[PDB]
Structures are given as C-alpha cells and as structure tokens.
C-alpha cells in the first residue's frame, strides 16, 4: 500500500530539512559527487549569513569592539562574489576576524530583534574546517544548506515494507494544479513548528507573533472538514534552541497570560497544550505530538520510526 505524507508549517520550521534527513536515512544518502556539488552552496549560505548579521548591526545601532574591523566589511561586499567559483584565505581571514568580534557576537546574541537563519552559527563556528582548499562537505553540512525553492519538493522511499511519497509544498502557486493534488488523498499531515520563535520580536509586517500565526494555520487545518480521515502529526521542532533560549527569555513574551515557571518541560507542555487545544473535534480526532530536532539525524530516525509504527497500527484496524 502507498502512503502520502504532507509536510506543512510556516517557513523556517524544518520541512526541507526533514526531507533531506529522509534522503539520508531511508535512501542511500548524499554521495561524494553531490557533496562536492554543494560546496559553493555552503560558502554562499555562510557569506549571506554573516552579511545579514552585518546589515542587522545597522538598524539596531551596534558599535564594533575594535573599529578597524569596519574595513573588512567594506572588503567583504567586494569579495562576496569571489566564492561563486573557493574561499580566498584573505576572505576567510575577513570572516574569521569579523566572527571573532565581540560586538558582532552581541548582535548575534540579540538575533531575536531581526531575521537571522538558524544555519548561521553552524557554518560560522566550523569556519577553519571549510576554509581549507581541499574541503569536502559532510552530510551534516549539506543538511544545514539553505536552498531557494521554486517548485514542489518531493521524495519517495521504501521502508518497513511500505511505499512512502512525501511532499513539501512551499508557496509557489505558480503551479496551481498538481500543487492541489498534493492535498488530495493524504494519509497523514506533518505540521512543523519552530519553538524558538516564541520570543521573536514582532516585525512591522506582522499582525501577531510567529507562534500565533502557526497556531492559526493549525486551527485552520485540524478543523478543516477535508482532513477528517487524515492523521494529524505535530512536530514541535527546534527543541534545542528552545531549551537554550528558555533559560533567559520568558514565555510571557509569547503568552502574557502564562503563569507557570520557565522550565523547558513545563513551557513546552504549555505550548503543546496550546496547539492541541485548538482541535474542535477532540473526541473523533486525536493529534500525534513529537518534540523534534531536525538536524539530529538520530532523533529524526527514531521519531519517524515511531510515526511509521503508528500508521501501521492504524492500518490494521
């Protein structure tokens, strides 16, 4: 029998990352040729990240430690296309010096007040490793790659004697046909949520914080009369970043009515509760919640295994 899996959830919730992970686990994974191909992509993402932090330093008015580093920035924008083919030791030197600066790190520590991708620090901390001329990207490096998507992402595989077709939709209604067929005859829906976005500052183009957006979307999905026969699976992803953040920034930011303590456990419980509470068919429809970290291949392997077993058990009735 065939299984149609549909990944939904806001941007930056780990869907593409989940897909890549699937390619690693149940398929052969990424070969050395492909790994070689993604090099330029890695360099690019690294650069775009550090640049983004730099431009972000402006709007917040954040002064450097030692002023000299300023010159590097000027040089940076010129060398920004120098990696479009291999990183110059001069360029890698620039990035190193910049990432070493304390003010830049203060901005990075204040990354909630703007928009910084979550694959930044990964690439920036492992700079020395990738700035070598003979560098070949690891599978984990490829996992953290950020690729602009234009169409519908699809991947298929065989596992536990079952045929899985998994769809990531994205946003392009440039394709208005097949796009919709991705919502047709779905076995189960996997809604992804970035927990770490609880403390994000309200952008000027938002009417409600990102978490409440994810909530509204979920509300619209669960209680949609078209998925009555569809199993709903919730991935509260980015649990690691959540755990790190929750020590310092309170949940009251996201939910002002929250009375509990700021322990990871109790907080996460409150979030999960908040999402699950939106199901206006609690009797008929149950929701399958998991706390994931899509960058941890092992974790994803286990979670997906368990989900699969759930589906099989549902198939025997």
């Amino acid at each position: 029998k065939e299984v149609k899996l549909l990944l939904l959830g806001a941007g930056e919730s780990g869907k593409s990352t989940i897909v890549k992970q699937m390619k690693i686990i149940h398929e052969d994974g990424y070969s050395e040729d492909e790994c070689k191909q993604y090099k330029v992509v890695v360099y690019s993402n690294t650069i775009q990240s550090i640049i983004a932090i730099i431009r972000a330093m402006g709007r917040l008015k954040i002064d450097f430690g030692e002023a000299a580093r300023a010159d590097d920035a000027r040089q940076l924008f010129v060398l920004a296309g120098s990696a479009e083919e291999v990183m110059t030791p001069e360029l890698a030197g620039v990035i190193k010096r910049l990432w070493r600066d304390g003010g830049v790190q203060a901005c990075f520590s204040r990354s909630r007040e703007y928009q910084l991708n979550d694959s930044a620090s990964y690439y920036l901390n492992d700079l020395d490793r990738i700035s070598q001329s003979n560098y070949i990207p690891t599978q984990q490096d490829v996992l953290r790659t950020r690729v602009k998507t234009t169409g519908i992402v699809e991947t298929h595989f065989t596992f536990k004697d079952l045929y899985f077709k998994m769809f990531d939709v994205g946003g392009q209604r440039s394709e208005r046909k097949k796009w919709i067929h991705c919502f047709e005859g779905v076995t189960a829906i996997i809604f992804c949520v970035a927990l770490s976005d609880y403390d994000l500052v309200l952008a000027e183009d938002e009417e409600m914080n990102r978490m409440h957006e994810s909530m509204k979307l979920f509300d619209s999905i669960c209680n949609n009369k078209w998925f009555t026969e569809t199993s709903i699976i919730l991935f509260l992803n980015k649990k690691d970043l959540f755990e790190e953040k929750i020590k310092r920034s309170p949940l009251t930011i996201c939910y002002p009515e929250y009375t509990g303590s700021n322990t990871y456990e109790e907080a996460a419980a409150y979030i999960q509760c908040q999402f699950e509470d939106l199901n206006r068919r609690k009797d008929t429809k149950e929701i399958y919640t998991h706390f994931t970290c899509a960058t941890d291949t092992k974790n994803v392997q286990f979670v997906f295994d368990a989900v699969t077993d759930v589906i099989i058990k549902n198939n025997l009735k």
Binding site: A10, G171, E213
Partner: peptide, 22 residues
Amino acid sequence: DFFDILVKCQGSRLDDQRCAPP
C-alpha cells in the same frame, strides 16, 4: 478561506540568506 490563510502565514521563508540549487 483556508488557502488564503495558508499563504498569509507561510511564504516568509527568508529568500536572502538562501542560495540557488545546484
């Protein structure tokens, strides 16, 4: 109504800090 919600909340994917596929 569902679809306009879908798009009203999705596409904010940070297309900068993101490069073109190989």
